Design a protein around this ligand. Structure first.
Ligand SMILES: CCCC(CCC)S(=O)(=O)C[C@@H](NC(=O)OCc1ccccc1)C(=O)N[C@@H](Cc1ccccc1)[C@H](O)CNCc1cccc(OC)c1
Length: 371
């Protein structure tokens, strides 16, 4: 826990959450995007049309070239650069400094966002998925080995300019309500979790739970949308369309292309269903569920306009930022589990409310994992 980290995140809708950091000696200040979806710490180290500032290794008396190149291809977007180490600090985070690996981005393609206000990315996932390989120790691992910071972190992403919190090394009880529920981390590469059941407005999607994790399911703060495997994505949309069949929208809308708008304050929330994702529990045949309100999957962009924030994937399910916004998520690395609880900045609806409920019986949860 810690008072000093409570409102340490910012960013605008659909463009990621970032924390302030400093690299080099003297300290160079940079806004770094918090990404539990990757494992590389990387910062712009050269001019780019979208960067307002960048890491200047020549001005840091502590920079050390590892004389190895590196590149990372993301779902959408990629960068190239040079590996080296330097001292790093999180002003509104723990009170320590550590020497961490840093990828000085020299070239990039569809990575940096125009007007996002962040110049780097902090991959908080495990080494197993780092570039060039798992031998490049991720930032957090370094932080944990060099300091006393406990091996754990929590994220409170709030919807809207946007804000939130990253509690390095603990859980701040003032950021959530109710009980914290934990789902195991299936394997330590991405923050993989196993989905056991899916319901739209109470109706079971009735699919083979293996489909929910076809390939895999991960908790990715680096991704905006809820990403679903083809088959699941088609079932969901079909169900969501029917629920709101009272009104008609263009195919481009469901594809995430063109947005939809309603006269200010007249958004028909009631016609959009809630989605419940049941996750594997900590006890035998026991699971729990988190419920997403349409306010979460209809991202805001005169009138009120929104973008359907659920899209199909060919790389498994991705519990993106919109899924995380209604809750307080605990990345308990130390106990290989992830916790969910209603967030202090929860979403609102006079008649409906996002939730984290348990316990639930769910037989054969193991058969839900993909192989
Ligand atoms: C900040 C939110 C940007 C969105 C809005 C853009 C209009 S996004 O689009 O949701 C970002 C997503 N992109 C996305 O979801 O793209 C979908 C898409 C749309 C159109 C065409 C192709 C793909 C994504 O790639 N995220 C990675 C972080 C990142 C941050 C900022 C810029 C580029 C990347 C994250 O690390 C991926 N974690 C799984 C992963 C996957 C593969 C290899 C990995 O390496 C360890 C790891």
């Amino acid at each position: 826990s810690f008072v000093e980290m409570v409102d340490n995140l910012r960013g605008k809708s659909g463009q990621g959450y970032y924390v302030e950091m400093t690299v080099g000696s003297p300290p160079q200040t940079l806004n770094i995007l918090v990404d539990t979806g990757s494992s590389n710490f990387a910062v712009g180290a050269a001019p780019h049309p979208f960067l307002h500032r960048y890491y200047q290794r020549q001005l840091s008396s502590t920079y050390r070239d590892l004389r190895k190149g590196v590149y990372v291809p993301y779902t959408q977007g990629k960068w190239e650069g040079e590996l080296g180490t330097d001292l790093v600090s999180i002003p509104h985070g723990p009170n320590v400094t550590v020497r961490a690996n840093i990828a000085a981005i020299t070239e990039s393609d569809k990575f940096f966002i125009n007007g996002s206000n962040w110049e780097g990315i902090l991959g908080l996932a495990y080494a197993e998925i780092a570039r060039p390989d798992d031998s490049l120790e991720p930032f957090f691992d370094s932080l944990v080995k060099q300091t006393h910071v406990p091996n754990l972190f929590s994220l409170q992403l709030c919807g809207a300019s946007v804000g939130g919190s990253m509690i390095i090394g603990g859980i701040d009880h003032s950021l959530y309500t109710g009980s914290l529920w934990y789902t195991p981390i299936r394997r330590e590469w991405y923050y993989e979790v196993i989905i056991v059941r899916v319901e739209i407005n109470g109706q079971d999607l009735k699919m083979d739970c293996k489909e929910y994790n076809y390939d895999k399911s991960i908790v990715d703060s680096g991704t905006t949308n809820l990403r679903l495997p083809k088959k699941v994505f088609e079932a969901a949309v079909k169900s969501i369309k029917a629920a709101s069949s009272t009104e008609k929208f263009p195919d481009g809308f469901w594809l995430g292309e063109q947005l939809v708008c309603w006269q200010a304050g007249t958004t028909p929330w009631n016609i959009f269903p809630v989605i419940s994702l049941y996750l594997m529990g900590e006890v035998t045949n026991q699971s729990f569920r988190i419920t997403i309100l349409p306010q979460q999957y209809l991202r805001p962009v005169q009138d009120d306009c929104y973008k359907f924030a659920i899209s199909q994937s060919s790389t498994g399910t991705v519990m993106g930022a919109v899924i995380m916004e209604g809750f307080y998520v605990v990345f308990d690395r130390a106990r290989k589990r992830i916790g969910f609880a209603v967030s202090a900045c929860h979403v609102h609806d006079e008649f409906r409310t996002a939730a984290v409920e348990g316990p639930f019986v769910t037989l054969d949860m193991e058969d839900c994992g993909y192989n």
